[PDB]
Design a protein around this ligand. Structure first.
Ligand SMILES: *[C@@H]1O[C@H](CO[C@@H]2O[C@@H](C)[C@@H](O)[C@@H](O)[C@@H]2O)[C@@H](O[C@@H]2O[C@H](CO)[C@@H](O[C@@H]3O[C@H](CO)[C@@H](O)[C@H](O)[C@@H]3O)[C@H](O)[C@H]2NC(C)=O)[C@H](O)[C@H]1NC(C)=O
Ligand SMILES: *[C@@H]1O[C@H](CO)[C@@H](O[C@@H]2O[C@H](CO)[C@@H](O[C@@H]3O[C@H](CO)[C@@H](O)[C@H](O)[C@@H]3O)[C@H](O)[C@H]2NC(C)=O)[C@H](O)[C@H]1NC(C)=O
Ligand SMILES: *[C@@H]1O[C@H](CO[C@@H]2O[C@@H](C)[C@@H](O)[C@@H](O)[C@@H]2O)[C@@H](O[C@@H]2O[C@H](CO)[C@@H](O)[C@H](O)[C@H]2NC(C)=O)[C@H](O)[C@H]1NC(C)=O
Ligand SMILES: OC[C@@H]1[C@@H](O)[C@H](O)[C@@H](O)CN1CCCCCOCc1cc2ccccc2c2ccccc12
Ligand SMILES: *[C@@H]1O[C@H](CO)[C@@H](O[C@@H]2O[C@H](CO)[C@@H](O)[C@H](O)[C@H]2NC(C)=O)[C@H](O)[C@H]1NC(C)=O
Ligand SMILES: *[C@@H]1O[C@H](CO)[C@@H](O[C@@H]2O[C@H](CO)[C@@H](O)[C@H](O)[C@H]2NC(C)=O)[C@H](O)[C@H]1NC(C)=O
Ligand SMILES: [Cl-]
Ligand SMILES: [Cl-]
Ligand SMILES: [Cl-]
Ligand SMILES: [Cl-]
Ligand SMILES: [Cl-]
Ligand SMILES: [Cl-]
Ligand SMILES: [Cl-]
Ligand SMILES: [Cl-]
Ligand SMILES: [Cl-]
Ligand SMILES: [Cl-]
Lengths: 737, 109
């Protein structure tokens, strides 16, 4: 029947907006519960919540489901190592609220001011903002996955990363020469560890300045990067927003040209606000100024002409300041000293950043602060498109709602601790719900020293982060895969091998995120919302609908207990890649064996996943034959898909420059359905079909009507492994009986 | 008027440490927690905005909101405009703005 999912009514006095779900009459929003405040620097709007289950309101170190026990959540972008109760690098004023029975809705407050969000156990929520207007969107779902898609309809669907961006990334603070940086690639290669992308931190720079490289350790920087490209790898390096202001006039083009074009945030007298960051005195680019965008495009393109980097790692874009406000302090006014200061670390909007009353092209820093990182990511996305002519790869510390349309994120300066390994799962899930699916934590942790056991477990779980980078602090002990004992190296290699085998699937999941507003890493409650036992699960994750990952997140464990929704879950260990074979769950907790060399991964019955053969890079792996893993229902059914393009071109979906194939298992047959076949995808070789849940040994296996060269059946695991010679882009029929 | 269940008490002193006398002078209720929950909270009669001139548009609704008693914050905007837009079957959108002054809005496409 044509009608909205919502109905709206108003309270006259006191004023309130009341939103019902039409289908069951549930009250979703009711702003009559508390007074409306609307003062120049204080907005407060409250509502009842439908349940005690609410997620969102990044960026904080917390469970996926937020506490309603008088919790104050502060949105004010801040450079601080992740710790509970603190405003961190990003701000996302969106929540998703679950309703009894498994429906959900979402609320977005389109407001970029410093804010507190207060949750109370009635249950209820109060938005408390320090400026701007109330601009409120309600998304009616009813499925949690539909709420997320509807939110991303407003803020933007996730960008499509290049395929190579899904490979392994390796970085540290402290690779102090091209010789040492090359030895990292050599050492990974010697020990058969895949590595798509070598990174540097600020080591490369001349006197810690952007768009320079030192002529000591990094004299042959251009040659190093050209050599990485010759070997089939990409290169990433850190870029800071702050620009050295102290160099002799005419000696440092980024500053000299920025000054000429007026690209910087200015103060009361109209001069550049000067802070202190890595090179000493710095000015801060204003990424709301169209002229700053042109300047940034030029600085990136000119630097790319010297050193052909493949993306940008944008750090310290809160913006982070080593001193409070500016070298000259900040004026005493109502923006610097507002009537309501949200619960920010340090008790002032100025702490670890620039003056709130500083001037930007569109408004004051007071209003735009929470957009600083996002505006730099937009500027960097555009700069990289213009410089390279292929898909950009931007990884940003600071974010705001809609970030995922332009860039990915890493969760910042996490300790090498079992607690932060565990905390990374809810945080990666939270960023997926917020449309930033390209997210991960520093594998093995950033601060302090990892242990070998922690780094095995962290590599195992981290291989299921959509963005997988091992990164390490300056004073830390080394933590590259090859730096560990042989048994630890074997476990880390197996984790990277499995991730590389799954890359066609992971890429297809990113395609669904980009075209349909889907999550890549998703909590169980997004897939099984009608099972209320899933609502508090945040130490397991799904990839898409079908792949359940149950990591060990504690020292000294050789088992793990995880939730299994109703259905059959096949142990992915039964699928050949270059302990019960099936969990038959009624919706229950299951204790799994999980020795040090193991991470539990189960494939949901009814799904088919595409795999590809091995390589130490995606340049190599993308040339390998493919395989299917076919997880049959009891009834003999399964479905899956593959999206394939050239891995890096712009405007692929608009130009139709891709292949899209559906796989269907029914009645002891497997077929493909050709949605679109083009030159990109045409010669993809299918050489192996592995079928899980085959109750009896077949007498014969046919491929296109002829007995196959070879197959094996295991009566113990119920797996049928079939050798074939087929093309993804040509109709085939595989059958058994 | 002050008989509000503890979990349903909304904080009338979010801005500062307050005494019972200051709390009651704001027109709020002062009830210490027995053990967080706000001690100073709004009665159901606390002055808010009143809805006036609710009107129907092809997109949804528009109204005036009027506050007659100031809050304890400086620079209350006493006259607001409400716009309600029924944008899709699953997306409802509303704004509350100052009709007399353009205020800062987040740039969004
Ligand atoms: C609620 O709306 C009413 C009615 O407003 C009128 O109708 C609307 C659909 C719009 O077209 C309005 O632009 C239009 O004015 C408001 O009451 C009205 O207030 C105005 C301004 O005070 C009154 O104007 C006066 O009219 C008399 C002669 O009739 C003159 O002598 C005065 O100089 C002055 O122009 C108007 O009479 C009055 N109308 C009615 C029916 O009461 C009301 O203010 C508004 N409420 C709020 C809070 O905004
Ligand atoms: C706005 O930003 C500008 C910088 O772009 C600030 O300029 C600074 O002004 C201070 C004086 O207030 C200068 O300090 C002086 O330096 C000289 C020697 O160089 C010294 O002899 C004086 O005793 C004093 O320390 C400072 O040099 C200058 N900075 C630069 C880069 O020129 C200005 O103060 C800012 N305005 C406000 C209101 O914050
Ligand atoms: C991280 O470890 C480093 C280095 O630790 C030392 O060397 C290792 C090989 C290992 O065997 C450790 O047990 C050694 O103690 C720490 O840096 C050292 O810190 C100590 C005490 O602060 C200092 O006296 C040493 O001289 C430092 N050594 C070096 C080589 O820098 C660092 O403190 C550790 N970090 C944390 C957070 O524990
Ligand atoms: O790019 C490095 C690092 C990334 O690896 C990380 O992933 C990312 O989240 C944060 N960045 C910036 C770290 C800034 C720390 C400064 O901490 C005080 C500080 C440390 C420090 C350490 C070594 C040498 C000099 C300094 C220094 C000099 C002046 C003022 C302050 C300092
Ligand atoms: C929306 O919230 C308001 C305020 O909490 C509710 O209105 C109160 O309802 C109680 C119980 O029916 C009454 O005794 C009060 O007089 C009402 N207060 C006001 C200020 O009107 C209201 O019921 C909620 N609306 C819905 C549909 O749940
Ligand atoms: C790459 O691996 C080489 C070989 O293991 C490392 O070189 C050794 O490093 C240790 C210090 O930890 C020295 O004591 C040895 O003299 C080195 N051995 C050889 C054969 O050169 C090297 O440091 C590794 N480099 C990186 C960047 O990881
Ligand atoms: Cl909870
Ligand atoms: Cl290139
Ligand atoms: Cl303007
Ligand atoms: Cl403004
Ligand atoms: Cl349970
Ligand atoms: Cl349990
Ligand atoms: Cl494993
Ligand atoms: Cl064949
Ligand atoms: Cl008192
Ligand atoms: Cl007061």
């Amino acid at each position: 029947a044509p009608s909205p999912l919502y109905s709206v009514e108003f309270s006259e006095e006191p004023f309130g907006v009341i939103v019902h779900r039409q289908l069951d009459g549930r009250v979703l929003l009711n702003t009559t519960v508390a007074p409306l405040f609307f003062a120049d620097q204080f907005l407060q709007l409250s509502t009842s919540l439908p349940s005690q289950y609410i997620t969102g309101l990044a960026e904080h170190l917390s469970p996926l489901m937020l506490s309603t026990s008088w919790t104050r959540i502060t949105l004010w972008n801040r450079d601080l190592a992740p710790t509970p109760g603190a405003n961190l690098y990003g701000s996302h004023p969106f929540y998703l609220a679950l309703e009894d029975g498994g429906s959900a809705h979402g609320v977005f407050l389109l407001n970029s001011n410093a804010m507190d969000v207060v949750l109370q156990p009635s249950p209820a929520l109060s938005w408390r903002s320090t400026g701007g207007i109330l601009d409120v969107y309600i998304f009616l779902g009813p499925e949690p996955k539909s709420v997320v898609q509807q939110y991303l309809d407003v803020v933007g669907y996730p960008f499509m990363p290049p395929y190579w961006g899904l490979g392994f990334h390796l970085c540290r603070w402290g690779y102090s020469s091209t010789a040492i940086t090359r030895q990292v690639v050599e050492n990974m290669t010697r020990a058969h560890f895949p590595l798509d992308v070598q990174w540097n931190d600020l080591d490369y720079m001349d006197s810690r300045r952007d768009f320079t490289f030192n002529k000591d350790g990094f004299r042959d920087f251009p040659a190093m990067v050209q050599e990485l490209h010759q070997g089939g790898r990409r290169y990433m390096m850190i870029v800071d927003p702050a620009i050295s202001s102290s160099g002799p006039a005419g000696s440092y083009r980024p500053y000299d040209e920025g000054l000429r074009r007026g690209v910087f945030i200015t103060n009361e007298t109209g001069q550049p606000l000067i802070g202190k960051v890595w090179p000493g005195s710095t000015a801060f680019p204003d990424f709301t100024n169209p002229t700053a965008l042109a300047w940034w495009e030029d600085m990136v393109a000119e630097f790319h002409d010297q050193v052909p980097f493949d993306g940008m790692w944008i750090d310290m874009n809160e913006p982070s300041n080593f001193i409070r406000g500016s070298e000259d302090g900040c004026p005493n006014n109502e923006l610097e000293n507002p009537p309501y200061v949200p619960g920010v670390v340090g008790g002032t909007l100025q702490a670890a950043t620039i003056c709130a009353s500083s001037h930007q092209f569109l408004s004051t820093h007071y209003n735009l602060h929470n957009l600083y990182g996002l505006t730099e990511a937009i500027a960097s996305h555009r700069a990289l498109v213009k410089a390279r002519g292929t898909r950009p790869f931007v990884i940003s510390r600071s974010t705001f709602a809609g970030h995922g349309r332009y860039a990915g994120h890493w969760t910042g300066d996490v300790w090498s601790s079992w607690e932060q390994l565990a905390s990374s799962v809810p945080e990666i899930l939270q960023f997926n719900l917020l449309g930033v699916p390209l997210v991960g934590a520093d594998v093995c942790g950033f601060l302090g020293n990892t242990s070998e056991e922690l780094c095995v477990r962290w590599t195992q779980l981290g291989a299921f982060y959509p963005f997988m980078r091992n990164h390490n602090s300056l004073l830390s002990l080394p933590q590259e895969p090859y730096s560990f004992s042989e048994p630890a190296q074997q476990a880390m290699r197996k984790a990277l091998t499995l991730r590389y085998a799954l890359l066609p699937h992971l890429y297809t999941l990113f395609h669904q995120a980009h075209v349909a507003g889907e999550t890549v890493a998703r909590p169980l409650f997004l897939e099984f919302p009608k099972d209320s036992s899933t609502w508090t699960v945040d130490h397991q994750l799904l990839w898409g609908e079908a792949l359940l990952i149950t990591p060990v997140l504690q020292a000294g464990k050789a088992e793990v207990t995880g939730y299994f929704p109703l259905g059959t879950w096949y142990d992915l260990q039964t699928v050949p890649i270059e302990r019960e074979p099936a969990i038959h769950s009624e919706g229950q907790w299951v204790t799994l064996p999980a020795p040090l060399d193991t991470i539990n991964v189960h494939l949901r019955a009814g799904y088919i996943i595409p795999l590809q053969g091995p390589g130490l890079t995606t340049t190599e792996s993308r040339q390998q034959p493919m395989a299917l893993a076919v997880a049959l229902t009891k009834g003999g059914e399964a479905r899956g898909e593959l999206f394939w393009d050239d891995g890096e071109s712009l405007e692929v979906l608009e130009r139709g420059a891709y292949t899209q194939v559906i796989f269907l298992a029914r009645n002891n047959t497997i077929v493909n359905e050709l949605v679109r076949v083009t030159s990109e995808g045409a010669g993809l070789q299918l050489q192996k079909v592995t079928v899980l849940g085959v109750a009896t040994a077949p007498q014969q296996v046919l491929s296109n009507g002829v007995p196959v060269s070879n197959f094996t059946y295991s009566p113990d695991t119920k797996v049928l492994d079939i050798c074939v010679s087929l093309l993804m882009g040509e109709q085939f029929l595989v059958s058994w009986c | 008027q002050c008989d509000v269940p503890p979990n349903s008490r909304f904080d009338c002193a979010p801005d500062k440490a307050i005494t019972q006398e200051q709390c009651e002078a704001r027109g709020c209720c002062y009830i210490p927690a027995k053990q967080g929950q706000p001690w100073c909270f709004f009665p159901p009669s606390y002055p808010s905005y009143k809805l006036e001139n609710l009107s129907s548009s092809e997109m949804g609704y528009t109204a005036t909101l009027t506050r007659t008693t100031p809050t304890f914050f400086p620079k209350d905007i006493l006259t607001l405009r409400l716009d309600v837009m029924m944008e899709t079957e699953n997306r409802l959108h509303f704004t509350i703005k100052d009709p007399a002054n353009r205020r800062y809005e987040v740039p969004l496409e």
